[PDB]
Amino acid sequence: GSMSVLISQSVINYVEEENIPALKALLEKCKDVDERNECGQTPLMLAAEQGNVEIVKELLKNGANCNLEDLDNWTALISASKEGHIHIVEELLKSGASLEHRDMGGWTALMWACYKGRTDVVELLLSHGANPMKFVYKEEHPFEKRRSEGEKIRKKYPDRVPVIVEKAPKARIGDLDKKKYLVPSDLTVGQFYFLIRKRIHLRAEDALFFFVNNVIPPTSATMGQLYQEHHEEDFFLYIAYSDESVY
Numbered sequence: 001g002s003m004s005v006l007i008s009q010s011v012i013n014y015v016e017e018e019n020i021p022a023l024k025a026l027l028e029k030c031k032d033v034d035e036r037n038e039c040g041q042t043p044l045m046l047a048a049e050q051g052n053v054e055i056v057k058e059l060l061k062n063g064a065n066c067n068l069e070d071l072d073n074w075t076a077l078i079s080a081s082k083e084g085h086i087h088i089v090e091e092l093l094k095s096g097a098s099l100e101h102r103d104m105g106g107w108t109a110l111m112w113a114c115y116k117g118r119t120d121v122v123e124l125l126l127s128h129g130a131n132p133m134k135f136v137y138k139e140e141h142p143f144e145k146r147r148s149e150g151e152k153i154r155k156k157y158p159d160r161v162p163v164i165v166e167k168a169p170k171a172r173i174g175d176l177d178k179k180k181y182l183v184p185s186d187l188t189v190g191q192f193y194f195l196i197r198k199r200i201h202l203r204a205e206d207a208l209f210f211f212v213n214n215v216i217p218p219t220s221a222t223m224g225q226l227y228q229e230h231h232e233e234d235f236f237l238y239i240a241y242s243d244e245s246v247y
Helices: 004-017 020-027 043-050 053-061 076-083 086-094 109-115 119-127 136-140 143-156 189-200 223-230
Strands: 160-167 180-184 209-211 237-242
Touching: 004 020, 004 043, 020 053, 043 053, 043 076, 043 086, 053 086, 076 086, 076 109, 076 119, 086 119, 109 119, 136 160, 143 160, 160 223, 180 189, 180 223, 189 209, 189 223, 223 237
Parallel strands: 160 237
Antiparallel strands: 160 180, 209 237
């Protein structure tokens, strides 16, 4: 690692200088194109803000993982979307960049594009399906690891849907011993409320709220319907639970 930051920086220098031949020559000698600078940023993330699509294409061609995040949970897609680099955004989406990843502030790439008035980027992101608290499971496992697990679960147990359930930040309620659930698609949201309440060992007077994508799901919906509406791109459905203290 004594050299890792230096090699990362030399890559970033050729990105910033937009020196494609020197960049390609160095990348043919790097054992990891995603080696991070001293702030945990990958060359792809810096190229995404720079705005040269050919640099981005070369990095992706050499194996750059567009779903990596820095210490602010920022991604290449959020950088390109904030700066309005429409062709970079398109290349990242083609490589499988997650649309709904949020930065440390809770903002997605679409929210950044709207904030900055990036008209074409907004249309592109919506065209690819962008939807118009941080889960420990999401924060502590890289996106593509989670996506492989979710795809495995969808293949092996097609009658059921995978759900991650976690307690909302600083809620006056007991904790769950297990966070991973696999439930029949025709189980209703109400039945799932009851299952989670039983696992937390609550009294009938103790309130329990569910939140998915910051909204309360109707109890008459099935978990399969909720999943089809709300599942993330790692193929997990994420539900936060709390008592009234979160209000």
